Amino acid sequence: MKELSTIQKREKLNTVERIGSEGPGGAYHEYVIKSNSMDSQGNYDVYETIKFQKGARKEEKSQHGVIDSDLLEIVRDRLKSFQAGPFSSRENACALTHVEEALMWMNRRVEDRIERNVLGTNTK
Amino acid sequence: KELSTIQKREKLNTVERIGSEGPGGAYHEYVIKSNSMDSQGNYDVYETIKFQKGARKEEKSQHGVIDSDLLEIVRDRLKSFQAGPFSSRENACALTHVEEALMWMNRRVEDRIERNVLGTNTK
Ligand SMILES: Nc1ncnc2c1ncn2[C@@H]1O[C@@H]2COP(=O)(O)OP(=O)(O)OC[C@H]3O[C@@H](O[C@H]2[C@H]1O)[C@H](O)[C@@H]3O
Numbered sequence: 001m002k003e004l005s006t007i008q009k010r011e012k013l014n015t016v017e018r019i020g021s022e023g024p025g026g027a028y029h030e031y032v033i034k035s036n037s038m039d040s041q042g043n044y045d046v047y048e049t050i051k052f053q054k055g056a057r058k059e060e061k062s063q064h065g066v067i068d069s070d071l072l073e074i075v076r077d078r079l080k081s082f083q084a085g086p087f088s089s090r091e092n093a094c095a096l097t098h099v100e101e102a103l104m105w106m107n108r109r110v111e112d113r114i115e116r117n118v119l120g121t122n123t124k
Numbered sequence: 125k126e127l128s129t130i131q132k133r134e135k136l137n138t139v140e141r142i143g144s145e146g147p148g149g150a151y152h153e154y155v156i157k158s159n160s161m162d163s164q165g166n167y168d169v170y171e172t173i174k175f176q177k178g179a180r181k182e183e184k185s186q187h188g189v190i191d192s193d194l195l196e197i198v199r200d201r202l203k204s205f206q207a208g209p210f211s212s213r214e215n216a217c218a219l220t221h222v223e224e225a226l227m228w229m230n231r232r233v234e235d236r237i238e239r240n241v242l243g244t245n246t247k
């Protein structure tokens with residue numbers, strides 16, 4: 001099936017699906033976020049598509065798109081705003097630290113690929 | 125408006141928040157724009173992500189995505205990469221933190237379910 005088996009199991013607001021097939025590196029590069037709610041005519045209230053950068057930078061015929069760290073930075077900024085507001089919680093605090101530490105580890109991979117001169121190539 | 129990202133060098137795209145703070149003091153619209161340009165100076169990538177503005181059971185709330193959806197996408201991407209030929213230790217640490225972050229977001233959802241406040245503009 002195309003639907004992602006998410007960690008949240010109950011009272012999910014939206015459904016996330018993979019679109020297409022596996023591409024470079026064995027990963028899908030197109031995802032759909034659709035709401036579980038419908039309008040008055042039975043169509044999705046939300047139906048958004050996220051297109052990832054398919055093909056590394058230096059490899060030819062690559063297609064420009066969003067990168068994974070961009071999505072985490074949005075989530076990082078959202079959690080920081082909620083923690084600064086009136087509806088803060090310890091759950092937000094732990095999730096924020098993990099998002100930032102995940103963002104750091106993705107930066108570590110970026111810098112490591114700059115040291116080995118492999119950034120933007122189909123290498124390990 | 126531009127987000128200060130942890131990655132400082134060789135950034136593919138630039139993220140910026142659109143509009144003003146909304147419910148809970150957070151922004152509900154972001155734009156991902158690539159640093160690359162075409163021959164005339166146009167941004168190659170320019171996607172828009174609008175969040176659920178207002179709790180789902182409150183009136184006038186606008187339907188949108190939420191943060192756990194974005195992490196689940198990144199979670200599935202890292203799982204596929206780790207199962208592919210380009211696995212790395214950095215992805216393994218990033219995937220664990222992303223998943224653990226998702227479990228804390230679900231911990232918040234389950235807490236609001238027990239306290240019967242999920243989908244309401246409360247604390
Ligand atoms: N956590 C990862 N993030 C991205 N890519 C990863 C990861 N883990 C393994 N890979 C593989 O290495 C290749 C180049 O890596 P890279 O240095 O990051 O290139 P890039 O300029 O950043 O673009 C990225 C695009 O590259 C294509 O192949 C990628 C992946 O298959 C993909 O379609 C990417 O979407």
Ligand SMILES: Nc1ncnc2c1ncn2[C@@H]1O[C@@H]2COP(=O)(O)OP(=O)(O)OC[C@H]3O[C@@H](O[C@H]2[C@H]1O)[C@H](O)[C@@H]3O
Binds near residue numbers: 180181
């Ligand atoms: N990590 C958080 N994620 C979401 N919301 C958070 C967080 N931390 C604090 N809040 C605040 O509690 C309210 C209800 O939360 P909730 O139980 O999750 O309702 P919801 O159906 O999931 O929609 C969510 C929308 O609610 C509106 O107010 C929210 C937030 O201000 C916002 O616009 C939301 O975008």
